[PDB]
Design an enzyme around this catalytic site. Sequence first.
Site, PDB file in Angstrom:
ATOM      1  N   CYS A  26       0.816  -1.209   0.000  1.00  0.00           N
ATOM      2  CA  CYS A  26       0.000   0.000   0.000  1.00  0.00           C
ATOM      3  C   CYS A  26       0.852   1.263   0.000  1.00  0.00           C
ATOM      4  CB  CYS A  26      -0.953  -0.008   1.193  1.00  0.00           C
ATOM      5  SG  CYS A  26      -0.173  -0.241   2.796  1.00  0.00           S
TER       6      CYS A  26
ATOM      7  N   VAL B 232       0.459   4.400  -2.638  1.00  0.00           N
ATOM      8  CA  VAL B 232       0.189   5.780  -2.248  1.00  0.00           C
ATOM      9  C   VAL B 232       1.190   6.728  -2.899  1.00  0.00           C
ATOM     10  CG1 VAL B 232       0.156   7.367  -0.286  1.00  0.00           C
ATOM     11  CG2 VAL B 232      -0.991   5.154  -0.120  1.00  0.00           C
TER      12      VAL B 232
HETATM   13  S1  CLF Z   1       5.119  -2.903   6.075  1.00  0.00           S
HETATM   14 FE1  CLF Z   1      -0.720  -4.100   5.722  1.00  0.00          FE
HETATM   15  S2  CLF Z   1      -0.123  -6.060   4.630  1.00  0.00           S
HETATM   16 FE2  CLF Z   1       1.076  -4.409   3.491  1.00  0.00          FE
HETATM   17  S3  CLF Z   1      -0.181  -3.914   1.681  1.00  0.00           S
HETATM   18 FE3  CLF Z   1      -0.997  -2.352   3.214  1.00  0.00          FE
HETATM   19  S4  CLF Z   1      -2.435  -3.429   4.560  1.00  0.00           S
HETATM   20 FE4  CLF Z   1      -1.569  -5.016   3.210  1.00  0.00          FE
HETATM   21 FE5  CLF Z   1       4.100  -3.317   8.106  1.00  0.00          FE
HETATM   22  S5  CLF Z   1       2.813  -1.441   8.285  1.00  0.00           S
HETATM   23 FE6  CLF Z   1       1.533  -3.098   7.299  1.00  0.00          FE
HETATM   24  S6  CLF Z   1       2.680  -5.043   7.588  1.00  0.00           S
HETATM   25 FE7  CLF Z   1       3.201  -4.066   5.591  1.00  0.00          FE
HETATM   26  S7  CLF Z   1       1.362  -2.544   4.966  1.00  0.00           S
HETATM   27 FE8  CLF Z   1       3.313  -1.548   6.071  1.00  0.00          FE
END
Ligand code: CLF
Lengths: 522, 522, 475, 472
Positions: free
Chosen positions: A152, A156
């Site tokens: 994500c 963005v």
């Molecule tokens: S590093 Fe979360 S799994 Fe991702 S693509 Fe957005 S929802 Fe899906 Fe850490 S904070 Fe989270 S786990 Fe990754 S997105 Fe970032």
Amino acid sequence: SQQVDKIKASYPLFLDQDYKDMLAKKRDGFEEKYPQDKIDEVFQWTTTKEYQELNFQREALTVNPAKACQPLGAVLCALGFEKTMPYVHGSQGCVAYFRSYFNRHFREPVSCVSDSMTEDAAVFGGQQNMKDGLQNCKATYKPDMIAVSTTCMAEVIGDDLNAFINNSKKEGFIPDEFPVPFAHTPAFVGSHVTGWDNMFEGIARYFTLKSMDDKVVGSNKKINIVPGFETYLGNFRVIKRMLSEMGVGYSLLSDPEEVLDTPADGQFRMYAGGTTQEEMKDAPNALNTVLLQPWHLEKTKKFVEGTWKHEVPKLNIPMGLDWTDEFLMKVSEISGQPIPASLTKERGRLVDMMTDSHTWLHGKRFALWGDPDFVMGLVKFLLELGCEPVHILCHNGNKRWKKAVDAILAASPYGKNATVYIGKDLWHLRSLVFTDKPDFMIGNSYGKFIQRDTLHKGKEFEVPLIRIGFPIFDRHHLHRSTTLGYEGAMQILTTLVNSILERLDEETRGMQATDYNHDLVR
Amino acid sequence: SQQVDKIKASYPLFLDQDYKDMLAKKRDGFEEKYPQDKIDEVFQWTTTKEYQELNFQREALTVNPAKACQPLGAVLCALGFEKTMPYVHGSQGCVAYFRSYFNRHFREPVSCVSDSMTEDAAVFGGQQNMKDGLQNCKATYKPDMIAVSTTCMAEVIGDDLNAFINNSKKEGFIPDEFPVPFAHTPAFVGSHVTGWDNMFEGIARYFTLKSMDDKVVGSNKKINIVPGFETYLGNFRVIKRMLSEMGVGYSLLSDPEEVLDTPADGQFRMYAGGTTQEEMKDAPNALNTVLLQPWHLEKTKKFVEGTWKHEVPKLNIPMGLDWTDEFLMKVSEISGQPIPASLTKERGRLVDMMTDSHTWLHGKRFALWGDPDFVMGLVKFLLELGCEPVHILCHNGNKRWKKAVDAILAASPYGKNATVYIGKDLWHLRSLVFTDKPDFMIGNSYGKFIQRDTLHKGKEFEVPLIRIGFPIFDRHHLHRSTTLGYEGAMQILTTLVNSILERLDEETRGMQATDYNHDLVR
Amino acid sequence: MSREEVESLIQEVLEVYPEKARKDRNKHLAVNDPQSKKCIISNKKSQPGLMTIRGCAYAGSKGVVWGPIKDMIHISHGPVGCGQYSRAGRRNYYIGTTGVNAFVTMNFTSDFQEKDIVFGGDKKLAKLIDEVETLFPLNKGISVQSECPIGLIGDDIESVSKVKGAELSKTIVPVRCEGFRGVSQSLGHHIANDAVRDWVLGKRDEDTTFASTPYDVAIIGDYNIGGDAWSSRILLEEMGLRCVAQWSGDGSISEIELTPKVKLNLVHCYRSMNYISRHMEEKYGIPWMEYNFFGPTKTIESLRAIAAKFDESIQKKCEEVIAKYKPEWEAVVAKYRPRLEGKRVMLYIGGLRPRHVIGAYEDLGMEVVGTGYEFAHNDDYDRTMKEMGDSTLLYDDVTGYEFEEFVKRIKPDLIGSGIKEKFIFQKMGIPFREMHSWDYSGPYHGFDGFAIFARDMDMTLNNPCWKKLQAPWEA
Amino acid sequence: SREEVESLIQEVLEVYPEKARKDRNKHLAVNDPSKKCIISNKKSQPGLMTIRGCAYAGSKGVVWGPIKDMIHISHGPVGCGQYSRAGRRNYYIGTTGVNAFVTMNFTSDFQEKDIVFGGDKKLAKLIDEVETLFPLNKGISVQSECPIGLIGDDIESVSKVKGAELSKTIVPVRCEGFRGVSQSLGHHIANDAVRDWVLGKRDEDTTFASTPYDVAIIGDYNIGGDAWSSRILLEEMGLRCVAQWSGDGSISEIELTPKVKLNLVHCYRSMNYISRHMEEKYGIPWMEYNFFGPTKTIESLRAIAAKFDESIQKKCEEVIAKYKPEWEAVVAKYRPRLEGKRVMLYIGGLRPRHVIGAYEDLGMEVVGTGYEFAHNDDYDRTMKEMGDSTLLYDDVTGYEFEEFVKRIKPDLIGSGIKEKFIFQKMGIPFREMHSWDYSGPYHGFDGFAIFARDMDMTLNNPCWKKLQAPWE
Ligand code: CLF
Ligand code: ICS
Ligand code: ICS
Ligand SMILES: [Fe+3]
Ligand SMILES: [Fe+3]
């Protein structure tokens, strides 16, 4: 204390008196915990219709969702291709979670890489990450293909997947003929199944879009099969088994059954089986393309019809008796192959099981959830069994899907007390199984916490869970099961009837109280 | 009282207060029941070591046996032959019980006739019954063959089957060329598996003995497979499937899998499939004969070795990992065909499951019972899984078989707490699971009354039942499962591991008491 | 085996990498000489596309530090993914009524849609807090765990936290632990530690109503995996000490607020909690000490070291506890050590256990011939070289390719690592034990945990399944 | 119907040999609403796959088995007792293995040693072992299997000697399976054993406090609780049910039966023998009743109440008015779903006629019925219940029943487990009318709601529309 002859794990170790007194002292001394009668008051309140009405007024808070994010489905799609490395352009934390989630459901290795985009990339894009990541991946793990999705953060900031990959080839990091299909998989749109559709349409585009001039529909006399997001090994195998029994030439596009079931024979196989690039290149030459789960294959359908010029037939997921019948009759019409006697006999044996078990299934009320195609097939089969699917929840469903399910319910007396819920989570369902108690839940492992809550209110209010769906983490090897075709219908039937009988045996096991009905023969 | 909106069956209708007060009045008024404190006193006594000592001193009394009588197995054997009507010379009550017993296990029709010998036949014999019975059966149900066994009545009076049948053809009641194999199946000798051996040896006798001159061992390049008493449809199909994958020509002698699984398609099929008469006639021309359950095919073995001149290999039942391997290697040696990659991969997938589940199976203590071959294979596989078969019960096992099982136990560290019992019944086992409590029972439906007994002492003493064996009357469609080969080992493994996990979930479901260990992931 | 053999093993493995990756990975692979910086670096960015095992800062903050706090509600602020893959994945046990007064295994999230990405989610967060208050009145605080998009779109969760916190007289903790920050879970620990300091830890700086004793301690950095903290607490309280707080396994918000009142901070996991431990020594003067409850040798050593910080009465009760459990762990060794003596182990875990459990294996006659960390710092490797034997292999942020190649050549008897590695080596025929989740067993801390640990290594290492990998006809 | 049924009977009989043809012709008849049209209680023709059981089944499985606080010994080889263990749902209340033993299988497990030397020495040993391991039993019965009579054992002398040594009620029953032609003679043998060994134990006793409203339920074996749903109605009417023969029955209830004022016989076939004996010896009158469906239940309650005084007849009308809204709601819901549907029945000795009224209460029609082992006096009572042109069959064969169904094509069939799966595969809804398909109870008002629900769920189940594949 521990007795070396009978060692105790956490349960029941912490039930010993010295641990029990210790936990009581921690609670009373420093936790500043609410009194127990207040906890019981609030708990009883959360089982009421009043709390449910407040619960369904939510619009900003989500509690215990029944869905994942797109790139998880894009990974599962990529794993179905031969010697293919899933590659998620973005932050590495997501890949750790993707692999762990699948690790625990399939109890198998799950290979997937990241290009480890960090704070600096947030300002200037991850072009360099793509260049070095593609070259490092190809050199270290030797894949025949790298299928790129996105986290994500990369969505963005706006990284252009197409441009970054072309520059990697242009600058010599990987050969220009090395296949690198891509798809944008934004976690803030749709769900994991949307990611499956996006990744597959991306791979289809990569291998066919520019080479459509020499294609002619039907020249290879095969039927393309697109499974969609599928986490049961038996569902890939039963589709291939039935089409082989029919003598139908077919092409399963995205086939992970081999790589998710490698043998333990002394060596680790990172890759195994799967759809070949040659099968994707030749797919437009098929007679037609069948979408096993059309309600999350919308984007793929537009491409197959718009570019391959195939007339995708209107078919529901082949679950239950009616929809498996229609699936086979459509495959027969397209291929010119008759339905063999072996499948006719298998169908008759499922019907035989339905007649043998219909007295225990009749009227049983079920709550259930899952992905859109899986749910409506489950609903369809329940109605065929004479069951009532009172609570139908699909967190990642849409209005058009709910309209279809509502029409299926209206066409049967057993759908009279049924309601379809879209956009609701498992905290919504918790209220439903309290205020309008069903007999069982059919869902994934997260339902065990709803069974716990119902039991706390009382044994007569407990709603047992029947594990069918994804993910299943607290039982072993159910991922080998089947839910499609006649075989899957038999397995679901057997699981439902015996869950009913198991629950009955438990309620009639009390000696001299209820054991008058503890029959040997049922 | 009944509310037409929610009608109550016996359970829980009779928990209503008015029914409760009524049954209390019946007891206190006219039953002259012992006081409840005395009933409790006697019950706790039946759980003690002192009671177990009294219980094991039984010489004449048998309570809740784990075996049936011979003709039951003779019926099942005869059902495995094409258009064959099983025929029990004796009293009709036995056939009524034989059909109902199998009816409830397979949930399928079971065809079998009787010549209905009455009081006068006991004084003058049942010759006239045979003449009219054979003619009546042949004309009305039109079988291609009639396999004759006996009830204990006809055995006591000493009816000569060979003479009676020969007189029936001599007098023209049935054609001379009509096949009528026979076997004496005394209910007071052995058990139901002995009836299977006797019936089969009789059928092989009828079709080969008077024609061994023109037979040549190995001329048809096939291997005969004798399955023995088998009540899992999956076990017939896994043998045929593994031998077809090996490219091994084979002949399954006695194959009821078709007649015990006919489709529900609008017509009733009394006969279906089965071993053809031609296959029995040509059987001596096979390379060899493999006995899948050698411990109750004693009579058949002597005939095939002494008449067919086949060097029957010393193979155990192909259950578990080691004995399925030995089975396939011996088949490969006899046929000259190599074990294909598909079966090698299946084996590796079973090993993978064993490594995935070994932490939950390790050290688990089991009581189990059943027939000799099935029991020893289950013991072998449990030792392979790292479990402890504590109580091994085989009511119809013999001295030599127990020595064989003791050798299997001694060759593994997981059998040092195991004890093999022969000639004991389920009332003996009830004491063992009280005084030396295991974790689970593995047995047939009759074990549900032992689980109910263990629960009445307390939830901490409850020994859950895992239904594997024959007969299973309180669950639906378990007769479709598999217990042989890698496939059967995979099903058994799954059932064991998930039974353990279900029980753990139940014990850790109490909120704020034991749910700290109610893990989502296991 | 020999030092040159392992150094030549490293060279062959790196041959497959491109030049750039090869030069970076060489700095993260070394052979032990028992000044960690003088032979291996750590806390660096992962090379792209090499299949690292590391997670993100959100995992280090939400999944590790904040998640276990039971009477608080933790909001996964962002898209639906992160909170779902991390729901109930970590076995940080707790006592409570889930959904009423405890919420650890629940998943609260704002489920960002596209409209939230283009117009921000600060208005949605304010609504979310109000809905939480309505449906979960007994929550004693709220934490907002930021996922990747929150920082990239310019949201201001601190402003929402302050406004809503004053409006509702509630503790609302904003945590900017977006996954793109840092290089691993490690920075998530630090971010989470600073959040505790700035928004929770000082709530009772003025209060003196709590009655203090000279034996007040606090367990810092034990997350009660399978009950580890409960097995450690019982020992400390048998020694005469009063454990005021547990950070953060089975921890409550009030326990955190009371921690500045204790006399000594007992730090188990240095890596994740050293930040807040150094803060409490500067602001409150509370000293802290590291300890290790893995195995009898370390447990006894730590109990004596802890008791030496107090008076003779605690030292007296200390020897009482040691004498009480002595026959218990001696029986464990007597039974299991002959079954595990001489077996060699390779370890790859997070930031503490790759060294902390060495003594437990050595208490069973087992040798650790190789260990490594996902996200440790140089100070962790300093402490490792004293624990590891000489000429043993050390690897930082190991890659899937490296780990497989190292195992192929070293051929250990046992591997202890994480779920993403478990099924790889089981297929290679090497026994594997999960050293994050304890393979759903445990606890492993303390004397009671050592019995479980020895039982677990033995059941797996000597399981009959490991002799059946090869079919008899392929030999 | 009419001449069509007659030509159906003849067409079916054309497959038999001459001898069987002539015998089976006597056991098939078209009703003209018994001797005059059908014969019964004859031997079964050999090899025609009859459904009948044996005398052991009628004595051990039917009459004696349900007696809960006694221990019933299956004397002989291991088969009979095993196939009949917990096969019949004669429900009871008690602690199984301590003071109740219904679902347990006690057997002498005959080996060759016992066939040659006799089992009389083993039976005496068996009884000593029963006494030590099951001290709370209040009686023992010895159910003879086929070999016991053929070998020359004398269980009667073993019963007398041991019975006196232990001061226990030991009942020898000579129900060897080769006796009689069906389960029917087992009923008679079992009734006579009750008379000779149990029923007269308290002839001298006068301590029982009797009332003018004392009755006994004779011939209700509590299938799924049938007898409990009957008792509740009688006691609401003001009567006192001193005994139930033999569902949930105890040996003391049996000894108290000669003290009642009226015997209420539900199953005439199995229990009329002992009922006629109690009228001769103790002067107790007996009457037949029927608790299948509201029509028969109301009529029966009124006929029973008429045997007593004004207060009982008053309470009767209060009971009837209490349950009226309950069974009217059952009819209003399920009759429109079952009206006009045709049923064929084949059961044992009572239900093939006793349940007809309940089906008619739901607007259904019984176009054919028959018994396994009924006597002439049963078909007498049947021809008034059945309608004109309906088919009657006695000791039907598997071939006849299959051919009758294929021609009549009923909407529902009600029979046993040996017929169930044959007709389901033919696509015909089937309900077990012995075991209630593990449902019930079916007696009384509470049982009619379940009966209606069960007939609807099966007859109108969606599975029956899917028998034919859409591609044939
Ligand atoms: S590093 Fe979360 S799994 Fe991702 S693509 Fe957005 S929802 Fe899906 Fe850490 S904070 Fe989270 S786990 Fe990754 S997105 Fe970032
Ligand atoms: S907090 Fe850390 S990775 Fe110190 S992030 Fe990780 S429950 Fe590991 S080696 Mo999972 S620094 Fe704890 C850890 Fe160790 S989650 Fe657990 S096992 S002792
Ligand atoms: S006793 Fe008889 S065969 Fe009257 S032997 Fe049989 S529990 Fe039937 S028609 Mo099974 S004369 Fe009872 C009977 Fe009727 S076992 Fe039950 S249903 S009312
Ligand atoms: Fe696996
Ligand atoms: Fe069937």
